[PDB]
């Protein structure tokens, strides 16, 4: 719907202007565009990530920070796209072999006091949470597809650049092009990222008396 696309574009523009306009310092000393310069230096170093503080975002635009707290799954995609285009306008022109723009991972952090694993009740679902713990296990790095292309097995038609939802959730392949399951996923024409599952044990200070330590 055009209204929905307008909402997404407006929120993306607001995140873009946050990354373009945010400053730290005073007129008595000087100003540095914190996230502009972080984006530029990280992209030129080939890092392709930044670390947006929730308190800074709240100070610039409290509504964006509240939306990102309540609905991070929706709005982090817009924030990452905003960071990508800000990186484009901040870095270009680029030398040979660096013409194609790379995706930017917008990590984020907060000064707020953290919650705990046993405090994570059902009402915290799909919200931002901040919990401490100890890593007890760490998986080997495995590849997860972020975009795929699927080719019909019978007639060799192709659907390309299907956006995969982030996280451990998957994607449902269409049942219409042919057979009931017409498609296979093309192993070459898909883009993947590293992912790693961890087990986060509750802090021994945080375990209630007589309990075993939970893990998440």
Partner 1 sequence: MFVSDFRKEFYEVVQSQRVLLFVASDVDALCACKILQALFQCDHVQYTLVPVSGWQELETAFLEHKEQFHYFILINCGANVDLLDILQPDEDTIFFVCDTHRPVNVVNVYNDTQIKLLIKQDDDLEVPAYEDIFRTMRRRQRREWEARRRDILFDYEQYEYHGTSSAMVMFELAWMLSKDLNDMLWWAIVGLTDQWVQDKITQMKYVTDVGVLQRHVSRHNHRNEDEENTLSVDCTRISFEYDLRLVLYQHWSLHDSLCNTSYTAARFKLWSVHGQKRLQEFLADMGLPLKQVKQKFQAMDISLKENLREMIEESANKFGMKDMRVQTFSIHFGFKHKFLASDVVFATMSLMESPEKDGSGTDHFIQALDSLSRSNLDKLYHGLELAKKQLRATQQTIASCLCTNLVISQGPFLYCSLMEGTPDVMLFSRPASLSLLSKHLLKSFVCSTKNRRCKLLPLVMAAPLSMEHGTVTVVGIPPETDSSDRKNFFGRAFEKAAESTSSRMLHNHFDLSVIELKAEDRSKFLDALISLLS
- For residue 190, the minimal CB distance to Zn ion (Å) is 19
Q: Which residue has the tokens 């817009």?
A: 78
Is there a contact between 117 and 216 (Cβ–Cβ < 8 Å)?
yes
Q: In the complex with Zn ion, which residue's Cβ is closer, 154 or 197?
A: 154
Binding partner of residue 152 among Zn ion, partner 1, none, CB cut-off 5 to 8 Å per kind: Zn ion
Q: In the complex with Zn ion, which residue's Cβ is closer, 109 or 175?
A: 175
- For residue 116, the minimal CB distance to partner 1 (Å) is 11
Residue 122 engages partner 1 in binding (rule: CB under 8 A): no
Residue 135 engages Zn ion in binding (rule: CB under 5 A): no
What is the pairing mode between strands 191-195 and 105-109? unpaired
- For residue 113, the minimal CB distance to partner 1 (Å) is 6
Residue 22 engages partner 1 in binding (rule: CB under 8 A): yes
Rule CB under 5 A: which of 144-183 touch Zn ion? Answer: 152, 154-155, 177-178, 182
Residue 108 engages partner 1 in binding (rule: CB under 8 A): no
Residue 67 engages partner 1 in binding (rule: CB under 8 A): no
- For residue 1, the minimal CB distance to partner 1 (Å) is 28
- For residue 169, the minimal CB distance to Zn ion (Å) is 26
| Residues of this chain that bind Zn ion (CB under 5 A) | 152, 154-155, 177-178, 182
| Residues of this chain that bind partner 1 (CB under 8 A) | 22-29, 31, 54-56, 58-60, 62, 66, 110-113, 119
């Amino acid at each position: 719907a055009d209204e929905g696309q307008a909402r997404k574009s407006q929120l993306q523009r607001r995140f873009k202007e946050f990354l373009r306009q945010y400053r730290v310092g005073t007129d008595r000393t000087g100003f540095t565009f914190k996230y502009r310069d972080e984006l530029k230096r990280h992209y030129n170093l080939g890092e392709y990530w930044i670390e947006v503080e929730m308190e800074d975002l709240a100070s610039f635009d409290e509504d964006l920070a509240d939306y990102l707290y309540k609905q991070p799954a929706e709005h982090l995609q817009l924030l990452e796209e905003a960071a990508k285009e800000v990186a484009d306008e901040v870095t270009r022109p680029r030398p040979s072999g660096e013409e194609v723009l790379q995706d930017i991972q917008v990590m984020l952090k907060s000064d707020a006091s953290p919650s705990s694993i046993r405090s994570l009740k059902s009402d915290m679902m799909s919200h931002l949470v901040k919990i401490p713990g100890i890593i007890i296990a760490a998986s080997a790095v495995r590849a997860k597809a972020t975009r795929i292309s699927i080719q019909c097995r019978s007639c060799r038609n192709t659907l390309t650049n299907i956006a995969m939802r982030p996280g451990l959730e998957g994607y449902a392949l269409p049942r219409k092009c042919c057979p009931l399951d017409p498609y296979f996923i093309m192993p070459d024409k898909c883009k993947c990222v590293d992912f790693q599952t961890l087990k986060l044990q509750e802090l021994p200070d945080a375990v209630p008396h007589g309990e075993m330590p939970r893990h998440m």
